[PDB]
Amino acid sequence: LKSEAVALESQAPLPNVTSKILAKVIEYCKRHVEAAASKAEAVEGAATSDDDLKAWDADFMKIDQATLFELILAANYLNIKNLLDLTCQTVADMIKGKTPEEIRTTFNIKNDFTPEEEEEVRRENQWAFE
Amino acid sequence: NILEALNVRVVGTGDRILFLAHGFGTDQSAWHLILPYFTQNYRVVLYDLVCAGSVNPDYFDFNRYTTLDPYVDDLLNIVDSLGIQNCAYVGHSVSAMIGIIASIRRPELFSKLILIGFSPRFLNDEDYHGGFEEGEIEKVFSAMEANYEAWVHGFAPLAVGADVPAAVREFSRTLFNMRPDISLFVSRTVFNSDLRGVLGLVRVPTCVIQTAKASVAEYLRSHLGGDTTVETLKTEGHLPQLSAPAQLAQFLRRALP
Amino acid sequence: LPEPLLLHILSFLTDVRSRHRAALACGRMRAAERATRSELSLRGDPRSPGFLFLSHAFRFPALEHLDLSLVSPWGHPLLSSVISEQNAFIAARLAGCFPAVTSLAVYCRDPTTLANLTPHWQASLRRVKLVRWHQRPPTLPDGADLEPLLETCAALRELDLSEFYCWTEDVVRALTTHPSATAALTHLDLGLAAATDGFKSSELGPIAASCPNLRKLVAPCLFNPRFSDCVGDDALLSLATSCPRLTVLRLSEPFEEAAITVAGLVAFFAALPALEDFTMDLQHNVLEAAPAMEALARRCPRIKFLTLGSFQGLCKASWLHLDGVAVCGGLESLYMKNCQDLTDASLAAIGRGCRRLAKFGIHGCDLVTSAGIRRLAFTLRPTLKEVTVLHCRLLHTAECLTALSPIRDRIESSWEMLRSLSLWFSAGQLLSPLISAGLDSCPVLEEISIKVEGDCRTCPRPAPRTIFGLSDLAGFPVLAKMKLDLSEAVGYALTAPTGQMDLSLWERFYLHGIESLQTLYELDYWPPQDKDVHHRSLTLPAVGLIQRCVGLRKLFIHGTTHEHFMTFFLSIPNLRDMQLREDYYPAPENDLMFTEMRAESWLRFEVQLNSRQID
């Protein structure tokens, strides 16, 4: 299909996720053919801690360059859990060491908190974690 | 108010009132082992004293606690505020000094003075052995000033039995257990304080209990004006009430009413 | 910038310091949308909420797990009877702030803390954890402590007594006499503060019987043969036959042949087919184990995680004995006098996912078969070799094979993927030599644990200007979580006899590096114990040196101190979480003035702690 083999996963051609955006969606989706199919191969034993662990190699790749930001809305359009879960997690890891300044730098966000509100909504957080 | 700031605490059930005054280095929890030996036939009164670790350091007024006298103003203030006409008084060891003064100052108010690890001055004189040689005492100050001048300017003070311990480390060990400025302040009011020309002015009867190996006993036995039993314990130590309390519990019950 | 599907991004956060920045110290589009659904179900709070809990839109509707056990002051009984509107006023607003709590943890000094907390969450409440290091109230019924839960809270599936001190008889009574509730359980930890000499057979057998549906049971039991009432071959059977739905069973003999034989164990494992996770950890031993271990694989196919105590001859030499057992994800053999180079070699045929091996106190096993294993199993990532392994003494740091990959390491005394390291020093032993010129270089080491045992009173006076080289850990550059546990080091506290020396030396000796670990960010300091008093408390040097760790946000002292020594830590500029956590049985004051500390003091200290400007 356009912006056909093994596109079964999504909630089975539509301009919303256009070619640039949907291109990526195919990369990860047919990489999960290896994950499904390598269970069927090869010899009786295992050989089965490369999906559970080592398949996450290219999961933690493939997310060089957001937006991306619009890939979440594409992974939302197509109701595909394991891809949303993946990119939504990798946005998490951006919001970690970032101070509330550094968050709204690398996520273009308008600081609107009046210092009236702000340090009271802060004093909310001194009632946890200790 | 003073009763709050100085954590006074009354515990047992009885008519006879027992006052338990801790030493300098410690606080009132030094008495926690001994307390229940007497807590069932006595109203036991305890206080933390202003220079102890567990009192706020803000109540240390540095241009007030310059001599032993204001420590005594506190003791008598406490007693008056609880409204105690008479009590027996266990004091160790600067708080023995404080007890002696308070009983000269107010002999109505004490059944008996029981003074653990008492000496009237700790600066051993050319005559005679009542305390520690000034060479040693000097070394103890020499260690606390390091700690004070570490404490500002924000550095860790690390002076403990980095010392010399003639008879001195065990004594001075506990002194370090306060805020270093206050340690130094109350450490000097310990060694400059002499009250051996006040002993024969003591009317109320006194039992000294002394920690183990002419020496001291025979001096203060003759010189105290009250009736003067001097018992000595079996085992050494600054704090017979923490080490060895089952024993000190006995000498205490034996030196009462 | 999308909406409202940020709550799925936000929910994989998970660090609690980050969720505070974005959002509640940042912009609106998260500072309601985080405090609403995405709170990640967890909040362990700080201050007495029977003081000025004044808030308004402080509501967490998807909050599942709440933790009122670190609530301060730390020991104190929370809203019990020794007026109930003061309690119920607080319980209401705790329900208001967090409804839909499924999982609770509290510090249950007496049962009424429970009768006054639960009935709001009565319907939602699945797991409960009780915490009590203090003496039991000595006059309760004695099913008493557990009663309020089993009667009111009718969805109670899980129960975590791991750190709730009890008599063994409270557990017996409460669990055997609420059949409807007790026969609905699935998870049970009866390690009662590690205080009891274990559960007896007469005690254990009927607890199992009263809980037919149970999947995880974790407990200490009395194993010594010389008793009429040990857990043995029959008792284990009656455990298994009374609740076979067990997937996880962990069973440890406490301490300071015998009555379990392969005969019985085979009959035992035969009754428990669902067994995944199994541990028997005893001092008294099982003799030929091989036949019993085979049966474990034969009868429990799912068996993966297993750790065995004193269990002799698990595996002999060729052919296949403990190795019959296919699926072991993680194995820890614990006390074997018969586990040889040969046996290590072989169980290379258990590299299903041996991701964890461990040898504790197994002497005839050489530094060498070890190389064997890390070779043959090359996805083996945490390991542990310990306290009396005679041949391996940091020669077996110099074992290489898995230094590319081992994610954790434990040992008594590049590495390019060490996350977590755990040392066991003794007495006054030095750190730097036997670790850092042993083998040194760990560019991802974050957490490090140090334990020291014991008896300084019979040590030499660490040569003037000696140290425990905490400073030589400054090399490791993502090392942000420390845990220096001197607790089991006994000493003289405020007054040592003549010739001996007090602990402030030993605290110095130990703590004297930590200024230099600039990566440091979370310290857990257990100070040492004086033979006979049960307050562990800091001395001058300790507070002075800990004060200098300028980059800690969290500091936790498993002991106490007085108010003079408390204020040292306010100097630490961004230090935020600070508590005295006396989590050891028996834990002692305040209704008694037993230690240097007073709650008056710490409640005051805690104001100055979050009345400074902190990031």
Swiss-Prot record, chain A:
Entry GO terms, CC: cytosol; mitochondrion; nucleus; phragmoplast; SCF ubiquitin ligase complex; spindle
Protein name per the record: SKP1-like protein 1A
Tissues/organs with expression: Accumulates only in meristematic cells. Expressed in inflorescence, shoot and root apical meristems, as well as in developing organs such as gametocytes and seeds. Also detected in cortical layer and epidermis of roots, leaves, pith and vascular bundle of young stem, young floral buds and organ primordia, pollen and through the valve of siliques. Not detectable in mature root tissues.
Keyword tags: Auxin signaling pathway, Chromosome partition, Cytoplasm, Cytoskeleton, Developmental protein, Ethylene signaling pathway, Host-virus interaction, Nucleus, Ubl conjugation pathway
Region listing for Interaction with the F-box domain of F-box proteins, in residue ranges: 72-130
Organism classification: Eukaryota, Viridiplantae, Streptophyta, Embryophyta, Tracheophyta
Function: Involved in ubiquitination and subsequent proteasomal degradation of target proteins. Together with CUL1, RBX1 and a F-box protein, it forms a SCF E3 ubiquitin ligase complex. The functional specificity of this complex depends on the type of F-box protein. In the SCF complex, it serves as an adapter that links the F-box protein to CUL1. SCF(UFO) is required for vegetative and floral organ development as well as for male gametogenesis. SCF(TIR1) is involved in auxin signaling pathway. SCF(COI1) regulates responses to jasmonates.
Major localisation: nucleus
UniProtKB/Swiss-Prot annotation, chain B:
One cellular-component annotation, GO: nucleus
Consequence the record notes for mutating P165L: In d14-seto; loss of activity
Tissues/organs with expression: Expressed at high levels in rosette and cauline leaves and at lower levels in axillary buds, inflorescences, stems, roots and developing vascular tissue of cotyledons.
Gene Ontology molecular function, alphabetical: hydrolase activity
Broadest EC class assigned to this enzyme: hydrolase
Main location, first listed in the record: cytoplasm
Positions annotated as active site in the UniProt record: S93 (nucleophile), H238
Disruption phenotype annotation: Increased shoot branching. Accumulation of carlactone (CL), carlactonoate (CLA), methyl carlactonoate (MeCLA) and of their derivatives, including 3-hydroxycarlactone (3-HO-CL), 4-hydroxycarlactone (4-HO-CL) and 16-hydroxycarlactone (16-HO-CL). Corresponding hydroxycarlactonoates are also observed, such as 3-hydroxycarlactonoate (3-HO-CLA), 4-hydroxycarlactonoate (4-HO-CLA) and 16-hydroxycarlactonoate (16-HO-CLA), as well as methylated derivatives (11R)-hydroxymethyl carlactonoate (1'-HO-MeCLA), 4-hydroxymethyl carlactonoate (4-HO-MeCLA) and 16-hydroxymethyl carlactonoate (16-HO-MeCLA).
Pfam families: Abhydrolase_6
Disulfide bonding pattern of the chain: none
Enzyme Commission number(s) of this protein: 3.1.-.-
Stated induction or repression of this protein's expression: Not regulated by strigolactone, auxin signaling or bud growth status.
Highest rank taxon of the organism: Eukaryota
Subcellular location: Cytoplasm; Nucleus
Keywords: Cytoplasm, Hydrolase, Nucleus
Gene Ontology terms: biological process: cellular response to strigolactone; secondary shoot formation; strigolactone biosynthetic process
PANTHER family xref list: ESTERASE-RELATED (PTHR43039)
Subunit composition and interactions: Interacts with SMXL6, SMXL7 and SMXL8. The interaction with SMXLs occurs in the presence of (2'R) stereoisomers of strigolactones, but not (2'S) stereoisomers. Interacts with MAX2. Forms a complex with MAX2 and SKP1A/ASK1 in presence of strigolactone.
Family (UniProt): Belongs to the AB hydrolase superfamily.
Note: The initial nucleophilic attack of strigolactones by D14 causes an electron shift, followed by the addition of a water molecule, to lead to the release of the ABC ring product and the formation of a S97-stabilized open lactone intermediate.
From Swiss-Prot, chain C:
Compartment(s): Nucleus
Gene3D superfamilies per the UniProt record, alphabetical: 1.20.1280.50, Ribonuclease Inhibitor
LRR repeat boundaries on the chain: 90-113, 114-144, 145-173, 174-202, 203-234, 235-263, 264-291, 292-319, 320-345, 346-382, 383-399, 414-433, 434-467, 468-502, 503-540, 541-615
Any GO BP: negative regulation of seed germination
Keywords of this entry: Leucine-rich repeat, Nucleus, Repeat, Ubl conjugation pathway
Protein task: Involved in strigolactone (SL) signaling. Required for responses to SLs and the establishment of arbuscular mycorrhiza symbiosis in rice. Strigolactone-dependent association of D3 with D14 and D53 (a repressor of SL signaling) triggers D53 ubiquitination and degradation. Controls tillering by suppressing axillary bud activity. Tiller is a specialized grain-bearing branch that is formed on the unelongated basal internode and grows independently of the mother stem (culm) by means of its own adventitious roots.
Protein's name according to its UniProt entry: F-box/LRR-repeat MAX2 homolog
Protein encoded by which gene: D3
